[model samples]
Target: ISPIFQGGSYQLNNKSIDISSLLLDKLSGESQTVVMKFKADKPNSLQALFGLSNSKAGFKNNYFSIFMRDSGEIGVEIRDAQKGINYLFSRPASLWGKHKGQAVENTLVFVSDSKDKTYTMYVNGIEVFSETVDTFLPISNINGIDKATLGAVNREGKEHYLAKGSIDEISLFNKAISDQEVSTIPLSNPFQLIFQSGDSTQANYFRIPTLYTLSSGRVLSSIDARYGGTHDSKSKINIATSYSDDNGKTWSEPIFAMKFNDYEEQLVYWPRDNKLKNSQISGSASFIDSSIVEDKKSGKTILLADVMPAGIGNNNANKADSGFKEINGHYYLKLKKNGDNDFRYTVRENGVVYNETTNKPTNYTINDKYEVLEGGKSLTVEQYSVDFDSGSLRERHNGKQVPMNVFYKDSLFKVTPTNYIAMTTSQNRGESWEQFKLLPPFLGEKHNGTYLCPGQGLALKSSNRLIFATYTSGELTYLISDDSGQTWKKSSASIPFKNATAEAQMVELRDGVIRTFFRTTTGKIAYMTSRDSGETWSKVSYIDGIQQTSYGTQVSAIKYSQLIDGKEAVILSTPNSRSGRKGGQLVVGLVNKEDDSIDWKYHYGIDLPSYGYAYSAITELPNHHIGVLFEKYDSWSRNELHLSNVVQYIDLEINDLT
Candidate 1:
C-alpha cells in the first residue's frame, strides 16, 4: 500500500468485487487500460486519480486519466497536458438511470504513447475507449508508487462519489498522446517608482543653508535648524535665519526663528516619573529653517520652511502625540513681490492650510491677508475687500479691485499633511507672509520624519517654475513647480542619506551646475550635484573635514559677491566640537569648478560666552562685510535653551587667505 492511498479508509455499502487480485499492477511500455467491476444500489458517479509528476527525475512529459461511472456515464480529463489542448467526455443522466440495474463495468484505456511519456485509465476494463496526447510521464525522484484511488474522490479522510457508484480497476502507462495536452499554470507581473531615504534615528541633527534667494542675483542668506536629545528628556530643535550679500563672505545678525518644546502645549509632554526614573530621556523636535529666494520671473522672494510639529518622546506621550500637529505649530513662507516694500506671508500648520473662508481647517486653499510693510510709504491699507463667495481677496490692481482669489486658487498651495511638506509663498522681500497652503506629501511613507530639519524649502527661480527640497524621514526628495508655487510634482529623483535629519540647500552654480548640501544625523555635511536643473541627482558623499557627531550644521552662499578666481563659493557654519568641546565656528569653501568639490579656504572661530552653541546663519552685505547670527546659551544646563539670539559682524577681508 502506497502512503498516498493508505492514509484514508473507504466504505462500500455493496461488495465491490475484484475478479483478480485487489492489488493493481502498474502499466508500463505503452498506453494501457484496466477495468474494475462493482454493483450499484442506484446509479453511481466516477472519478479518476493520478500522481504528481517528478520533474527532477526526468519524468517531465504530460499524462492523462479517464473515469467511467457505474451508470454507463463517462467523463474524460487530461493532466500535465499541452498548453492549448483540452478534451472532456460525459454521458447523459438518462442513459445512466436506464442501465442502473445492469452490471456496471467501468473501463479506462490510453490510445497514445511516446518515449518517456505515460498515460493510464481505469474502468470496468476491456478497453472501452482510449486516446493519447504528447509529452511523456516518467517515474524518477518524482513521488512514484504513491497509491491512487480511481473512480472515487478523496474527501476528509474518506472517499466521496459522484453518485452511488463503485470503483473498478485502475491502470497506468509510460507514454504521451499525439493530439497534445493542456496544462494550467500561473504567471507574474512588475513594480512601480517611489522615492526612498536611508535611516537617521542614530543621528544628532542636520542643516541646509542659503535656503532662499533674491532676483537681483543675490543668494540671500543661510539659516540653521538643529535637533538634539538623549533617550528620555525633552529633545531640543531650534531654527535661526541670517543673511549674506557678498557671495557668502560677511554675515549679519541671526534672528531666533523657531524652536520646538514638548512642554509648550498640553498635547506634547513626557511622563515626569519616567524621566525621573531614568537619568537619561529621549524626545526630539525638528525644524528645517528655510531662507528666502526671489523668483527670477516674478521678482518675488519666497521663503519656505518645514518642521516636525511633535517631538518624539518616551512612553504613551510620543504615541499619542500627532506625528504633525494639524493646528498648533506652523511652517511659514514669506513673500515680497517685486517693487513691494512690505512682505506678505503664507502660513501652513502641519501641511494643512488654514482656511479663513470656511473658518475650518482644509487641505486646500490658503488664507492670505496683509502681514506688514517694510521701508514703505507707511500708508496703512486696511478693510481690504474679500470675495466671500470665491474665497479670494479683492486687490486693487490697475484702476479697479481685481479678484486675486482666482490666482491664489490656481496656486500649488494645497498639500497632504502627513510628514512635513507644507507651502507658504512670499510676494514681498521677506517682510511678511500669507496664510499657509498645502502641498503634496513626500513619496515614501516609511521615511516619514526621517529627513527633516530646517533652512531649505521653496526656491522659485521663475514665476512658472519652483524647486522645493524636503527630507522625508531620512530621504531627500525634490518637488518641481511649473506654475509658480501653486501646484507641484515630484522630480522622482533623490539623494539618499544614511542618517538624514533635515532639508538641504539647492543652488545653480554660475556654469549651470546645481548643488545641494545637507547634514547627516551623525553631524557630517553631505552633498550631491545635478547638471540638468535638478531632474536627477548623484549619490551623496561626505564633504571632508566636516565633523561627524550628533550636532547641527548650517550651509549658505553670499549674494552679489563675485568669485575670487571665477569660481563660486558658499559659507558653511557649524558647531565644531573637534576642538574638544562644542563651540561656534564658521568655515568658507570655494566650490571647485573642475570637479565641483569644495576647497577649504577660510575658517573663523566665533568667540562666544559659553560652549552651548548650536544653530547659526550667515549673510553678506554690500560693504563686503559678513554678518553672523546664532543661538546663545550656557553649555552647563538645558535651562538656557533659546536664551537669546546672537548677531555678529565679520569682515570679508579675512578670506584673503594671506
Candidate 2:
C-alpha cells in the first residue's frame, strides 16, 4: 500500500523566516503568484505575513507586503521609490475579527496578472478580493526587490509588524498560477479525504462522520457510506470505517464496519415522495449515524448505530411499535407467518422462533443472515434489489433475488417497521467487532424513534456508566448503560421540543457533571447539563453566542482532559453561520469551577463563510492535539444530484484553537 501525504506547521513570531535565500528570480516576471498558509495567534493589530523591500541606497520606502488588521482586513501594499507611486489593496473585509482571541487557519493566495491588469486575492480557497488598475505596477516593475522576510514587513534592513502565529507552507512563482492551481495548494491545517464521492467502497456518497480516539490512542473514523444518494434513509447507506494507529496522521482504506444484505447499490436522489407508497428505496435495508466509545473499566469499545429496516424511514416508521413485544415478562422480536394479521411467534434466544400461544419452537427460524429458515433450510424468497436506472425494488422473480423482509405479514418472522439502535462491541480498538446485538427499544415497545446522536460517546469517570446522546420523535434524550455496556436504558426525562432537539454530542465536565450540545431548529446551539449520570438533566438552555441555521447541523464536543490556559475546557465544533451551513468554527469554553458553567471564551474559524461546511466529529489526539473528521461541503442543500461529496480529516493544535 502507498503512504499518504504528511503536513505540519511552523511557529512564527518577531523572527520570521528569511525568504531571501529561496527568492532567486521567482517574482521578477510579468506575472507572479505568492501563497502562504497560516493561523493567526492574535489578530488584534496590524501584522505582516510577508514583506519585501528595495535595496536602492536605503530606499526602504519602496516595498511590497501582505498584512492583516484587528478588523479582520487582509491587504497588500506596493510602492515605487523612483516614481513615488504607492498602491494599497485592503478594501475587502475578512470575517476574522468576529472570532477574536482564536487562532483561525487561513490559506492566503495572491495572483498578480499583468496581462489582465488585475490583482486577485483568495482567502481559505475562496476569492475574497480582486481589483484591476490601469498601469498597475507589478512586482517585476518594483526595482531592487532583494531583501524579503516572512511574518514581518521588511523596510530596507529593519523588520516591523511581526506576526504572531504559525505558517504551514509558503511558495513563490514567477508566472501567474491559475485559480485552479492555487486551490491545489492545501490549507494551513490541511484536510485529507477520508471518504470521497467515488472510492474503492463503490459507495458514491458519505456523511455524518464520528471520530473517536480509543484509550489506546487508536483513532477510529466512521461514516455513512451512502450507496444511494445522501438521503438519511429509504436509501442504502452502510456504516463504513477506517482506523488510525498513529493519532490520525494516517488512516487505513475504507471497509464496511456494519452493513446489511448486499443488493444493487444504485444511485438514488432525495426529495422523493415519502407519502406515496414505495416512493423510495426503503427496501434497501441499511444502517446510518454511528456513535462510538470505549468503556474504561472493561477495556472494551461499544459502537451504536440506527438500524433501518428494509422499506422504512424515520418519518414513516411506526410510532408505537419498537420492533419488539413483551410476552409475559420477557421481550422478544415479534414475527408472523404467511396470511397472518397479528404476530403469532416470538424470536427468543438463539434466533429460535417460538409460537407465542403454545410457547414451542416453530418450523421457521431466523439465521445470522437475518433470513427466515423453513424446514431446517433457507427460504427461497425474492431478495430485495434496487434497480440502478429506476431505483425501484426488483426481484428475479422481478430481476434479482434473496430473503423476504421480516416485517412482511407473509414472512416467517416479524419485527417493527420502525428504526432501532444496534449495539456492537470491539476489544481491539475497532480492529474487529463481535456480539452484534439490537438494543430493545429504550421505551420498551413505545419508543417513538431512537438515533445514535452521531459522534463520540462518553464513559463517565463518576461510575461504570456509558452514555450517548439520543432523540425520540420530538425531543432530545440519551441512552445509558451502568454496567459498562452490559445493560442499557434510556433516560426518562427529555428536552421537550418538537423537531428541535436532535443529533447531539456529549462531553464530561467533571466526575458528576456532563454537558451535551445538540442541534436545534431555533438557529442556535442548545445544551443541557446532567449531574446525575444522565438520570436527570437541567432545563434546556441555548448558547446565544454560537449562531447556526434553524435546521441545525450535527455538532462535535469533547472535554479536554488537561487544563488549557489554567482552566479546564470543553471544545465544540459547529457551523457558525445563521444563514447556511457555512463558517465552520471551533468554540472553546472555559469551565467555571464555581458553578460548573461554561464561559464561552475562544472561537476559531476552520472555514470561511463562503465555503460549504457541515457535520463535524472531533477527538483529542495522543499529543493533546484535536483531530476532526468533518464534511467539507453543505450536506443539507440538495440542489444537485448530491451523488457524492468527500468527508475530510484535519488535526488542529490545542494552541491553534485557544
C-alpha TM-scores of all predictions: 0.42, 0.69
Top-TM-score structure, candidate number: 2
- The Cα error of candidate 1 at residue 544, in Å, is 2.0
lDDT of 2 by residue, 1-658 (tens): 1111112366776676676765744446577787777776455377888887775456877878888864356789988878676888763234232223345567788988888888988876556557788777787677777776777866756667788777776777776778778768766435666776445566766888988888788888888888756667867788877888988877877777677653555443332233322334555667888988889888988888888776667767787777787767667877766667887778878788888778789877777656688776877445454443544434322455556546432354657677888878777777777635777766766665576788888888767789888886666668888887878777854666775647788888888788888888888888888888788888888898988887888889989988988999999999898877767888999998998878889988875554556889998888889998887666676432242444667778878776
Q: Which residue ranges in model 2 land beyond 4 Å of their true spot? A: 1-189, 198-200, 265-280, 357-360, 380-412, 640-643
What tens-digit string does per-residue lDDT give for candidate 1 at 299-410?
Answer: 5655555543333322222222123323233324322233434323233543233444344544333333212222221112211211213332122112332222211211
> Against the true structure, what is every candidate's RMSD?
30.8, 11.4
* Model 2 accuracy (lDDT, Cα): 0.73
